[PDB]
């Protein structure tokens, strides 16, 4: 376990997985129980609530890093609005790579859900996106995707170089290249069998980005049709 010091500092910002799982599941089915039998939530509304809680967790993880904390709130906002759906999709993909079997989806609540039971309730776009996500899960598991690479990918997504109109763009540039060097060293060291594993890891970022943009546009158009509940962080995210 030869881990660079930067990767350890980045791992130090990882939230407690079982704690957040219990919090999210309790909040979710309690908000359920706070209605009676036929004023209950849709499955789509359940997933919206799950994504909202996961976005809260993403925000509290992002403000857990000094790199992000030392930026002015405007640049923090710009970063998060550029990268929030990408962080969501990447977190789901990593959860599938770790806890997932096959034939089922593992949720942020800690639930193993039958894959066909979910796929039969989703439309064509959501089914295609979930299929592409499972594809990337399989391709990453064939590469032995671990936690440190996942952390560095999170920090690379949070500090994208495509964000314009920033005050401290140089900070984002420096953090980007620091994480690049650290992750490159780590994976080329602890995984010498697959020379190309670093390029293979970096190649999948545009795919998660495109899936993120498609899902974000679908959710925006759906909430403009009223299918997403309110009093939300996801709403304010789409309302931008």
């Amino acid at each position: 376990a030869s881990i660079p010091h930067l990767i350890l500092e980045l791992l130090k910002c990882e939230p407690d997985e079982p704690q957040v799982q219990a919090k999210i599941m309790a909040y979710l089915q309690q908000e359920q129980a706070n209605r009676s039998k036929h004023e209950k939530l849709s499955t789509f509304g359940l997933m919206c609530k799950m994504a909202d809680q996961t976005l809260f967790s993403i925000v509290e993880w992002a403000r857990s890093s000094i790199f992000f904390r030392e930026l002015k709130v405007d640049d923090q906002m710009k970063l998060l609005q550029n990268c929030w759906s990408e962080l969501l999709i990447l977190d789901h993909i990593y959860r599938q790579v770790v806890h997932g079997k096959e034939g089922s989806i593992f949720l942020v609540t800690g639930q193993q859900v039958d894959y066909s039971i979910i796929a039969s309730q989703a439309g064509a776009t959501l089914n295609n996106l979930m299929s592409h996500a499972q594809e990337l899960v399989a391709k990453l598991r064939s590469l032995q995707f671990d936690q440190r690479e996942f952390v560095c990918l999170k920090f690379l997504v949070l500090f994208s170089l495509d964000v314009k109109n920033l005050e401290n763009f140089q900070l984002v540039e420096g953090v980007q290249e620091q994480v690049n060097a650290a992750l490159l060293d780590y994976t080329m060291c602890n995984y010498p069998q697959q020379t190309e594993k670093f390029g293979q890891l970096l190649l999948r970022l545009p795919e998660i980005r495109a899936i993120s943009m498609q899902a974000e546009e679908y959710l925006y158009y759906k909430h403009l049709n009223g299918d997403v509940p309110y009093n939300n962080l996801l709403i304010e995210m789409l309302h931008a």
């Binding site: 925000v59 403000r63 709130v73 906002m77 998060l80 609005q81 962080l233 304010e236 995210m237 931008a240």
Partner: peptide, 11 residues
Amino acid sequence: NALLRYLLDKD
């Protein structure tokens, strides 16, 4: 976005 600003300004 005011809710995100509130969250990030909670310090």
